[PDB]
Short mmCIF file of C-alpha atoms in Angstrom, two decimals:
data_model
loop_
_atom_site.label_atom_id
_atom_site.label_comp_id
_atom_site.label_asym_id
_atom_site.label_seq_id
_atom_site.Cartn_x
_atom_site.Cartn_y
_atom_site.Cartn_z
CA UNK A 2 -62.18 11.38 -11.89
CA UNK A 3 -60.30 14.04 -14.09
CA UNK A 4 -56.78 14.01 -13.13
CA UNK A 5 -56.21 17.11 -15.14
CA UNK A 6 -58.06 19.45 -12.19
CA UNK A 7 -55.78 20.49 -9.66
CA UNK A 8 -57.14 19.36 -5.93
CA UNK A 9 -57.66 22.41 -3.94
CA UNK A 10 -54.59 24.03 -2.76
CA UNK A 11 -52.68 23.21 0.97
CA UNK A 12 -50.56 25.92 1.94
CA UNK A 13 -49.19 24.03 4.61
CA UNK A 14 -47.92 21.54 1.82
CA UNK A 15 -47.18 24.66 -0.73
CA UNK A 16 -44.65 25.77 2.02
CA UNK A 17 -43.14 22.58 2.87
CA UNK A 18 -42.47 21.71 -0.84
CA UNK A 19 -41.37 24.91 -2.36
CA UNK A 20 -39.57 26.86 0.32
CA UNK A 21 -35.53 26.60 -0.45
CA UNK A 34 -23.62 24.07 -23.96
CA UNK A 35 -23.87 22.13 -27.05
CA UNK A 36 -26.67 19.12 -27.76
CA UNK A 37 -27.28 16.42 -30.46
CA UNK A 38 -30.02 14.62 -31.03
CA UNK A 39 -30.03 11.22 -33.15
CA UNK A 40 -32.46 9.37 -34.82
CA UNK A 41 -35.81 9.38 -36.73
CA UNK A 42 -38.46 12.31 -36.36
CA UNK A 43 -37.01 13.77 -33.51
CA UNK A 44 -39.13 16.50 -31.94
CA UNK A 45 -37.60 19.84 -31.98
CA UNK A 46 -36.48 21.15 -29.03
CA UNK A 47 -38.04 24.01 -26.94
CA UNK A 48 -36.52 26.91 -25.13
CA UNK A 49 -39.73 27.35 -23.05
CA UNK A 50 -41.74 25.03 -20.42
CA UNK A 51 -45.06 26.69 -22.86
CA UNK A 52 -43.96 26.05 -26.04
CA UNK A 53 -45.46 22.16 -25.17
CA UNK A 54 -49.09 21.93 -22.93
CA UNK A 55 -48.06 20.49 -20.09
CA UNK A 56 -51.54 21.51 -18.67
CA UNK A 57 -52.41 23.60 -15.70
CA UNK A 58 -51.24 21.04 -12.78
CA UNK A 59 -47.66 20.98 -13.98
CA UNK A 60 -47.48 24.65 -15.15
CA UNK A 61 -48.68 25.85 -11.55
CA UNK A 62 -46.39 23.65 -9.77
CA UNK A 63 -43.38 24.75 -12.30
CA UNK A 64 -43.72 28.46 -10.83
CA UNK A 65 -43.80 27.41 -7.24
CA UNK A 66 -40.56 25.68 -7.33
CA UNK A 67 -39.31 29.33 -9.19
CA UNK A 68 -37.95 27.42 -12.19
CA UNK A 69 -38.14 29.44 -14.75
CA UNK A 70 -36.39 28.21 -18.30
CA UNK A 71 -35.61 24.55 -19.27
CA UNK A 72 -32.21 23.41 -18.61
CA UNK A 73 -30.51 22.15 -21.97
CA UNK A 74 -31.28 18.48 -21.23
CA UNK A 75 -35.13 19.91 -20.54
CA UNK A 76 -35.31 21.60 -24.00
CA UNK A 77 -34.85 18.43 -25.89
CA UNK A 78 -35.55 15.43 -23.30
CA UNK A 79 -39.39 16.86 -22.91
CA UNK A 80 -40.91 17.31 -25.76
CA UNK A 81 -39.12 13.97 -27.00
CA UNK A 82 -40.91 12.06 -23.83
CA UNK A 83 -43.74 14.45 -24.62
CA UNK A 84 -44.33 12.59 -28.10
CA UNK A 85 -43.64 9.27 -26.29
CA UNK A 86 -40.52 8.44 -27.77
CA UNK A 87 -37.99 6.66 -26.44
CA UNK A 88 -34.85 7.99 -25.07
CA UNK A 89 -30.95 7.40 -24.34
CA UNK A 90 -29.94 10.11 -22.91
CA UNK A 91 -26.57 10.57 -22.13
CA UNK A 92 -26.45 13.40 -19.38
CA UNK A 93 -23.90 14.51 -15.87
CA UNK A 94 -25.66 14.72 -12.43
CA UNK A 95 -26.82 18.86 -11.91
CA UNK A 96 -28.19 18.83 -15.70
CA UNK A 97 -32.08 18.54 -14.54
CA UNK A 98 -32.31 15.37 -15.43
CA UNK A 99 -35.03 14.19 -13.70
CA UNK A 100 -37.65 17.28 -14.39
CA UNK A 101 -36.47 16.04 -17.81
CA UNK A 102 -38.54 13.01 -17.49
CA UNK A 103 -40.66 14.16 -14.14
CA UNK A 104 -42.61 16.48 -16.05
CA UNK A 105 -43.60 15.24 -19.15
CA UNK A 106 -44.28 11.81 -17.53
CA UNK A 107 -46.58 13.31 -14.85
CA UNK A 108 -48.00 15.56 -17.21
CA UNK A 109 -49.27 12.65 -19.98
CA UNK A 110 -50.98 10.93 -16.74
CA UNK A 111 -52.45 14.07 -15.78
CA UNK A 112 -54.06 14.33 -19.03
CA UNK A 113 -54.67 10.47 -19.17
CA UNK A 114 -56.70 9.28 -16.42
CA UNK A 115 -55.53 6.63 -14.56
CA UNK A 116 -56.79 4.63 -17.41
CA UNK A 117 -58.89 1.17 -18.02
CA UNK A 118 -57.49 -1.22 -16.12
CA UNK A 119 -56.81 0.76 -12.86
CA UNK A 120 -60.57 1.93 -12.92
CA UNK A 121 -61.76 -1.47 -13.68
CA UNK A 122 -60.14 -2.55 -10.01
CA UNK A 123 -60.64 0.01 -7.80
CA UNK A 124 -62.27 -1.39 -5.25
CA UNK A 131 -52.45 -5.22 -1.29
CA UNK A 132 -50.40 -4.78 -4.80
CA UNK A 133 -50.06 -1.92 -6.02
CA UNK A 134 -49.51 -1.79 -10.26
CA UNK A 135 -47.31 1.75 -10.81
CA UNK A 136 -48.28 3.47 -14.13
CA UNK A 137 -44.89 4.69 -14.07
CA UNK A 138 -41.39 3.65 -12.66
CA UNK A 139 -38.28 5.16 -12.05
CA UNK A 140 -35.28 2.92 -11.43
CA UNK A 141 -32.08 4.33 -9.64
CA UNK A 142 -28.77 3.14 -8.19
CA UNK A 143 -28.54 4.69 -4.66
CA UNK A 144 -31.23 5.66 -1.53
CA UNK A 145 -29.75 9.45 -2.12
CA UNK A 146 -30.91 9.39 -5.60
CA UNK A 147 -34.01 7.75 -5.15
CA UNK A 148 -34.97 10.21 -2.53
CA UNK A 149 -33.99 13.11 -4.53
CA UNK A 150 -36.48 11.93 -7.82
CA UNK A 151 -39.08 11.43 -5.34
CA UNK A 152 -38.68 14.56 -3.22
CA UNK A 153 -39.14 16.30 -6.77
CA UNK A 154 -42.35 13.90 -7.81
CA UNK A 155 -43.60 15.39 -4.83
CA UNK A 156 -43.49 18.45 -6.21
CA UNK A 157 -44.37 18.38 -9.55
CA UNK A 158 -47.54 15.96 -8.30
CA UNK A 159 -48.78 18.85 -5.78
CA UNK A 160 -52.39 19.13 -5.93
CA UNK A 161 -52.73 16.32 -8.12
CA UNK A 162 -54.58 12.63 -7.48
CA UNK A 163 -50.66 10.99 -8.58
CA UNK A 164 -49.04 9.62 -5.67
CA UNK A 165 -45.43 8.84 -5.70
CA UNK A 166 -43.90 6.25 -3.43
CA UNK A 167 -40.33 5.81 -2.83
CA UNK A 168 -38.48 2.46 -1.92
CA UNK A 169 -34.70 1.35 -1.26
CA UNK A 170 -32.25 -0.56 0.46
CA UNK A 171 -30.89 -0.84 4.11
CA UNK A 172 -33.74 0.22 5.49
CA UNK A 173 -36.79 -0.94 6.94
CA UNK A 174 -39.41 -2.94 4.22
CA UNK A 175 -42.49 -3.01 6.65
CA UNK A 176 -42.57 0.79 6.81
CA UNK A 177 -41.95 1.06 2.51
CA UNK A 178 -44.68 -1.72 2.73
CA UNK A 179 -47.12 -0.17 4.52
CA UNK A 180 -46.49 3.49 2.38
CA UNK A 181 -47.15 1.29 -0.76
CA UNK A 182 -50.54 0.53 0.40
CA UNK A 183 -51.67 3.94 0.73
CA UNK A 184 -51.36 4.69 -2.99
CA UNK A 185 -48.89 4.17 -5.95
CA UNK A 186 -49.01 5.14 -9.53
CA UNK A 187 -45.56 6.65 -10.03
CA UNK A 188 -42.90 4.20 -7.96
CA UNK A 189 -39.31 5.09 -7.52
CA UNK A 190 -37.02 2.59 -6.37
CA UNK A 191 -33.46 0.86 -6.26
CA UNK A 192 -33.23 -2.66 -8.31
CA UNK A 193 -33.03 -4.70 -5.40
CA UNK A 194 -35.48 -3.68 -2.88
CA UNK A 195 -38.10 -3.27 -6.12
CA UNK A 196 -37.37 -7.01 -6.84
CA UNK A 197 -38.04 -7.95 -3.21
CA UNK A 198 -41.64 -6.06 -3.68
CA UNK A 199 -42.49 -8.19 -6.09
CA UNK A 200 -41.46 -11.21 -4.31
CA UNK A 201 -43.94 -10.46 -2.11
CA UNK A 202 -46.52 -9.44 -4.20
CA UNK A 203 -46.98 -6.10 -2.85
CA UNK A 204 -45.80 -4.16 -6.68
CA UNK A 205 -47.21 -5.27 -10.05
CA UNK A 206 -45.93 -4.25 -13.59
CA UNK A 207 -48.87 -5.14 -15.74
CA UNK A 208 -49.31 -1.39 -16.28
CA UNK A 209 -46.35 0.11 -16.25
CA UNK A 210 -46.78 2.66 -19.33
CA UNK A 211 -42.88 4.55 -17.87
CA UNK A 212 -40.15 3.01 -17.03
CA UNK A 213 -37.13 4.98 -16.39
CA UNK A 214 -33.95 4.19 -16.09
CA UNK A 215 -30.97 6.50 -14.11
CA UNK A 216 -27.95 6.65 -14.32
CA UNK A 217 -28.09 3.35 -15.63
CA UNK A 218 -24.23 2.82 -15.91
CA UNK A 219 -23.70 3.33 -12.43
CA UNK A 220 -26.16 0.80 -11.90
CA UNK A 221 -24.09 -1.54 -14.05
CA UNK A 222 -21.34 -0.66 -12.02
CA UNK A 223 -23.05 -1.49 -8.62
CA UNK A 224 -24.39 -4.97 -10.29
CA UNK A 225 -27.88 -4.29 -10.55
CA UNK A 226 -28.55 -5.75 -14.39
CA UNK A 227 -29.72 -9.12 -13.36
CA UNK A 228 -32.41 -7.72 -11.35
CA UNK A 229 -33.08 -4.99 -13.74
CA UNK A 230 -33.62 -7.82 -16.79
CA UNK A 231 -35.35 -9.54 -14.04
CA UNK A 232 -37.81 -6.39 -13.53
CA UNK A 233 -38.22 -5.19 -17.46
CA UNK A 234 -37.67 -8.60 -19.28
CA UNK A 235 -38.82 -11.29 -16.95
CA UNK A 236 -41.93 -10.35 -15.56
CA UNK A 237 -44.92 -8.70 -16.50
CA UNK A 238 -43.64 -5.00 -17.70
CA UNK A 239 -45.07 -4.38 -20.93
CA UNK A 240 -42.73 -5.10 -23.75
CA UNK A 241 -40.93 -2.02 -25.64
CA UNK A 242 -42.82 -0.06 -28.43
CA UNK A 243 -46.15 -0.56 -25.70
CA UNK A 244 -44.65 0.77 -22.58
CA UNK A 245 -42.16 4.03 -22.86
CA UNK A 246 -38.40 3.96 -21.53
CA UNK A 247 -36.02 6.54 -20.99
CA UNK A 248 -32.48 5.44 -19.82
CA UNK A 249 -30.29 8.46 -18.85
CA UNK A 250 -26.52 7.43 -18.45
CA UNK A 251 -23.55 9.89 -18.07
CA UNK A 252 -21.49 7.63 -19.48
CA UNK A 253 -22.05 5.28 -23.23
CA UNK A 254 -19.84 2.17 -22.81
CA UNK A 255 -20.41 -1.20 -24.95
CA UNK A 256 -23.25 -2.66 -21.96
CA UNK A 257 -24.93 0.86 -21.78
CA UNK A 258 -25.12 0.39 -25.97
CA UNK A 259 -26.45 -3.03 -25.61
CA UNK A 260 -29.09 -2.44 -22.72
CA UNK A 261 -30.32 0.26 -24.37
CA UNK A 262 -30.61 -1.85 -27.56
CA UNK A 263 -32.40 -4.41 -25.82
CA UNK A 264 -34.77 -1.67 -23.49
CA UNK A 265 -35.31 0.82 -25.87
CA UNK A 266 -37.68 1.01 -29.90
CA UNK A 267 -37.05 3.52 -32.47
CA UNK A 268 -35.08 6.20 -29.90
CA UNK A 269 -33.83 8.80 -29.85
CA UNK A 270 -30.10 9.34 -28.50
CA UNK A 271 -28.91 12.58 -26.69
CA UNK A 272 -25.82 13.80 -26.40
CA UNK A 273 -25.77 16.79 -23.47
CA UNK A 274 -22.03 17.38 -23.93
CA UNK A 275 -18.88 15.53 -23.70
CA UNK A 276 -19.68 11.74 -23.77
CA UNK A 277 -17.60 8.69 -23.87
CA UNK A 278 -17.24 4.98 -22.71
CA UNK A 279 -15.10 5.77 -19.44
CA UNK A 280 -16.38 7.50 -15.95
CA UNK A 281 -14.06 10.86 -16.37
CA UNK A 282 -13.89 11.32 -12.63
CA UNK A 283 -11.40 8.51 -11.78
CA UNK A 284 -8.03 8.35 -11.69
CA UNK A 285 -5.88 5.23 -12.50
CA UNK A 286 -3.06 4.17 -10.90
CA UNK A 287 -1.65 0.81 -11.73
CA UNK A 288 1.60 -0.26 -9.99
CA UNK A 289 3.37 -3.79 -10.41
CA UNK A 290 3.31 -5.40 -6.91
CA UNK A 291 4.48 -8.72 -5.89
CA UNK A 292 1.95 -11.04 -4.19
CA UNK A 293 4.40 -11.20 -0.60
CA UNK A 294 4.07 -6.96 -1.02
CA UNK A 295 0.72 -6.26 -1.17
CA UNK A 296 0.21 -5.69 2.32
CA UNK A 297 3.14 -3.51 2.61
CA UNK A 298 2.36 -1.55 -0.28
CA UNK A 299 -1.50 -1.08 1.03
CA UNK A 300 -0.38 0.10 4.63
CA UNK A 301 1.78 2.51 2.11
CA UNK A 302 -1.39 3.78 0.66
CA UNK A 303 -3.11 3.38 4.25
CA UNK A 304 -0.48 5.62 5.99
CA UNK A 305 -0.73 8.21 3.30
CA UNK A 306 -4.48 8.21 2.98
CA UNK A 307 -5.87 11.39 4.45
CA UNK A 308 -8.16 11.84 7.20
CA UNK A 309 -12.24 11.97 6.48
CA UNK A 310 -11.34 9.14 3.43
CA UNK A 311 -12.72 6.61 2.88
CA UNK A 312 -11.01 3.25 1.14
CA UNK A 313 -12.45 0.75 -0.49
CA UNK A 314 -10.19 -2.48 -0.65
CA UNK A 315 -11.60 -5.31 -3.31
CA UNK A 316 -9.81 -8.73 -2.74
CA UNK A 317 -10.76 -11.84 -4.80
CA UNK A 318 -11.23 -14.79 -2.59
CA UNK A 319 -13.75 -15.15 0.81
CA UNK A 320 -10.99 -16.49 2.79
CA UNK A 321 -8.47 -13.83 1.44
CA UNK A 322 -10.90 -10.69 2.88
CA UNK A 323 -11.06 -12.31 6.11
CA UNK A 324 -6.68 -12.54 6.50
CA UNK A 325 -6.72 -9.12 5.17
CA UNK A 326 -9.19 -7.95 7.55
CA UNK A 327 -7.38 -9.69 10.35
CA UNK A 328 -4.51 -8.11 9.08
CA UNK A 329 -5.50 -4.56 9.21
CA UNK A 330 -7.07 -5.03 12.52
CA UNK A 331 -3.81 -6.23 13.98
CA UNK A 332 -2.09 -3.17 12.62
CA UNK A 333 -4.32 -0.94 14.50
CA UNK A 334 -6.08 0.27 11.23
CA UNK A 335 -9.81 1.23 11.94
CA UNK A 336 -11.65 -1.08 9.12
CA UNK A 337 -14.48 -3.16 8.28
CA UNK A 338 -15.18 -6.29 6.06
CA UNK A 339 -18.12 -7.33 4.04
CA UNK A 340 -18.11 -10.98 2.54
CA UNK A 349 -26.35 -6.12 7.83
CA UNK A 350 -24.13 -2.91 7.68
CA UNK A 351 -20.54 -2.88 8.37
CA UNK A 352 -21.43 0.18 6.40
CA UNK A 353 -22.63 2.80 9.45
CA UNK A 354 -19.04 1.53 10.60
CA UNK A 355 -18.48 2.85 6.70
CA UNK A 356 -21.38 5.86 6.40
CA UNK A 357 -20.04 7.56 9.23
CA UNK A 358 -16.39 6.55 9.20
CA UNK A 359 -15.61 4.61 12.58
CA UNK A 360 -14.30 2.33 10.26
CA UNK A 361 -13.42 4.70 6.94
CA UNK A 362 -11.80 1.32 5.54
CA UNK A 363 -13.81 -1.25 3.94
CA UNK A 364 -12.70 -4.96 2.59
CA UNK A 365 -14.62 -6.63 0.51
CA UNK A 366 -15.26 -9.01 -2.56
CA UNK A 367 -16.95 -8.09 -5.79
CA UNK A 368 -19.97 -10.72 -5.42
CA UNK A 369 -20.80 -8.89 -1.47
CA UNK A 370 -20.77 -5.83 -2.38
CA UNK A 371 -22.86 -6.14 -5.02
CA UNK A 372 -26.31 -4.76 -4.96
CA UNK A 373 -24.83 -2.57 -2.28
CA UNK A 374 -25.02 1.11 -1.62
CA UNK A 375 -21.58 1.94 -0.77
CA UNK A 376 -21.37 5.77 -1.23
CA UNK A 377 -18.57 8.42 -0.62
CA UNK A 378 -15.72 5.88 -1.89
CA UNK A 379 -12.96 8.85 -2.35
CA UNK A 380 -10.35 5.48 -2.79
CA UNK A 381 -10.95 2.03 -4.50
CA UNK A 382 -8.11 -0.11 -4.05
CA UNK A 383 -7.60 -3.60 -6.09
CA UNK A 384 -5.51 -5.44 -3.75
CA UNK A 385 -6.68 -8.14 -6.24
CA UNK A 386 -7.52 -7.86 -9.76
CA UNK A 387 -9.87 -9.67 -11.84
CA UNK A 388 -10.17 -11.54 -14.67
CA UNK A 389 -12.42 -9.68 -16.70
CA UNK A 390 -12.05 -5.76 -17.35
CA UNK A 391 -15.89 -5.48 -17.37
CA UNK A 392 -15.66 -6.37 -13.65
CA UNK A 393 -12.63 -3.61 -13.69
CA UNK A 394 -14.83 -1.32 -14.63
CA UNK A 395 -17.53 -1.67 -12.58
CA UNK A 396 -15.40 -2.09 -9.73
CA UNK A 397 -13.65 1.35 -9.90
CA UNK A 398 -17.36 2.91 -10.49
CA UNK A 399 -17.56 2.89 -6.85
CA UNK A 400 -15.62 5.80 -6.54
CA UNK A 401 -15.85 9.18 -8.54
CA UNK A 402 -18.13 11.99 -8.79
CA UNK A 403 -18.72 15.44 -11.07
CA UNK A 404 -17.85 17.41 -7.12
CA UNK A 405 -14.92 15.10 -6.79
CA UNK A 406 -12.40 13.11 -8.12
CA UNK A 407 -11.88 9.01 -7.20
CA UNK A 408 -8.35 7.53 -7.22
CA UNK A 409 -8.36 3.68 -8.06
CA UNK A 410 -4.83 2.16 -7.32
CA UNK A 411 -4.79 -1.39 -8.85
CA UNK A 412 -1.86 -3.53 -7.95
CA UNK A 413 -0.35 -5.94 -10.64
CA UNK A 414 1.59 -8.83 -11.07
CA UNK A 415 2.12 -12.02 -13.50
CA UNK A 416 -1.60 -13.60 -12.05
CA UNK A 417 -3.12 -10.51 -14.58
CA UNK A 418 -0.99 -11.07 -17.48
CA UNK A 419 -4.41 -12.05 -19.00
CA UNK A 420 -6.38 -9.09 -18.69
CA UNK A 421 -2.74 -6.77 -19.78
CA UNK A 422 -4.09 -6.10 -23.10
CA UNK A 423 -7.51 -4.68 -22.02
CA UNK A 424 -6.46 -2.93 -19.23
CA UNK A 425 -3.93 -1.00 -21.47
CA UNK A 426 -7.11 -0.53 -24.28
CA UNK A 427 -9.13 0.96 -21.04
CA UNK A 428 -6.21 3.18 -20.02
CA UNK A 429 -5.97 4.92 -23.23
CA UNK A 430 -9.30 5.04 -24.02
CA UNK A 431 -9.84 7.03 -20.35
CA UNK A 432 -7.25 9.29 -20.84
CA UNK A 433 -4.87 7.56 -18.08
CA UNK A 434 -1.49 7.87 -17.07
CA UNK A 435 0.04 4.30 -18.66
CA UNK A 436 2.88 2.46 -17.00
CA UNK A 437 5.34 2.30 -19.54
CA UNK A 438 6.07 -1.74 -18.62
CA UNK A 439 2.64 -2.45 -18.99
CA UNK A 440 2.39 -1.74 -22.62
CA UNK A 441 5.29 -3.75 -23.05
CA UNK A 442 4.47 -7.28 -21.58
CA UNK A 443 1.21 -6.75 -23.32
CA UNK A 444 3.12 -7.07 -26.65
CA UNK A 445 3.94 -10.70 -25.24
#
């Protein structure tokens, strides 16, 4: 029917929902901004459920994200976490379907897969959760019905919510991809995709599957579908995926932006291969309580001796090569080894220490590596140890250590010259 008539109000719902700096803008014919939610028509849906959640102005990502989703544009937004990002794109999404029906396609068929009109990728369950607990919100007394999915956790229930209804889907890479495996999500009409905080889920690995969701299936190709990627950070893969995602966008700058994560900081000390141990029970010993380490090693074989290692030493810990990661949420075992390859795709949250008892070869992997730690509440450490096996990657990890603002050994700048 018309989805721009607000269903008849549930009060029971009402109270279980609403109870609780400088900008640029780049590019061609970029909306202006607004300083008020009714300077655009959002129509009557949104605008009702905007004053029961006792928002009042646009935050400054708001005032120029919206009206620039609101003319279908497509975004790079680069934005912190606490800027109201995702009203940003909640509102004027849900508002264009509101005023849209459903459209063709989904009326033609309504008679198990579900095909979203809009989706919302995100790195993390917490996220997730938090975009969705807000669609919830903003789709109050409306026919839109958001469905959440993620990780480490139970598919048959996420299967069985999908069923009941989905036209705006958020989800985590991973789990997403498995949906589709099984046929249960299509893309065919996906009109929104969004991406956040896209270069944390760089960091985590997720870009295979997320080429695999927007390139490789059957997500309608850029210029015919609309994408927003928000990213607090703008490093070269961030340029390039939005290169590749995005047609004729616009870029936003909320602030200070750069290439490097801003919450992490760099230690890099030279240490022997016969030390490493030593110098990690070092960090171990001095590692406060409530912490929680995360120790990247390069080989299989190599996590398992260091495990063994650490478990001989009486040091509470965990390996991952199910869920050693309760033993990790909760922190009966705050220390967690690990190689790159197994913990990708993983949620590992609350790293306050990454520790690269090994490095690797590429500085991209570096990167995303130290990721795992370091947010706008608080600051990550990442202690790398170093020896002749990285000679190779000495020049780019100095270019990354300057470029972040680092302390910089002052031997590491010299056997880089070499």
């Amino acid at each position: 029917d018309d989805w721009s008539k607000p269903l008849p109000p549930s009060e029971r719902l009402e109270q279980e929902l609403f109870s609780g700096i400088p900008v640029e803008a780049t590019g061609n014919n970029c909306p202006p901004h607004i300083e008020s939610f009714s300077d655009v028509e959002m129509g009557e849906i949104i605008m009702g459920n905007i004053e029961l959640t006792r928002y009042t102005r646009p935050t400054p990502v708001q005032k120029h994200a919206i009206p620039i989703i609101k003319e279908k544009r497509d975004l790079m937004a680069c934005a912190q976490t606490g800027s109201g990002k995702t009203a940003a794109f909640l509102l004027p999404i849900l508002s264009q379907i509101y005023s849209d029906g459903p459209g063709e396609a989904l009326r033609a068929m309504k008679e198990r897969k579900q095909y979203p009109i809009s989706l919302v990728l995100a790195p993390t369950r917490e996220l997730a959760v938090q975009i969705y607990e807000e669609a919830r919100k903003f789709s109050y007394r409306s026919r839109v019905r958001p469905c959440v999915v993620y990780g480490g956790a139970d598919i048959g229930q996420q299967i069985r919510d999908l069923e009941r209804g989905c036209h705006l889907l958020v989800a985590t890479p991973g789990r997403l991809v498995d949906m589709m495996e099984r046929g249960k999500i299509g893309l065919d009409f996906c009109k929104y995709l969004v991406l956040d905080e896209a270069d944390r889920m760089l960091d985590m690995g997720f870009e295979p599957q997320i080429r695999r969701i927007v390139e490789q299936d059957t997500m309608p190709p850029k210029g015919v579908r609309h994408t927003m990627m928000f990213s607090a950070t703008f490093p070269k893969e961030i340029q390039m995926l939005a290169r590749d995602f995005l047609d004729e966008y616009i870029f936003l700058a909320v602030g200070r932006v750069g290439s490097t994560s801003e919450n992490i900081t760099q230690k890099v000390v030279w240490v022997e291969e016969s030390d490493k141990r030593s110098f990690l029970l070092d960090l171990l010993n001095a590692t406060g309580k409530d912490s929680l380490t995360l120790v990247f090693v390069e080989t299989k074989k190599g996590a398992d001796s260091l495990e063994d290692f650490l478990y001989h030493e009486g040091y509470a810990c965990t390996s991952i090569h199910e869920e050693a990661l309760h033993q990790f949420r909760s922190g009966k075992s705050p220390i967690l080894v690990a190689t790159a390859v197994a913990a990708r795709g993983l949620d590992i949250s609350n790293v306050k220490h990454v520790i690269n008892f090994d490095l690797p070869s590429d500085i991209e992997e570096y990167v995303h590596r130290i990721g795992r730690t370091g947010r706008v509440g608080n600051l990550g450490l990442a202690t790398s140890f170093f020896n002749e096996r990285n000679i190779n990657i000495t020049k780019d990890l100095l270019d990354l250590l300057v470029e972040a603002k680092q302390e910089v050994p002052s031997w590491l700048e010299n056997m880089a010259y070499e």
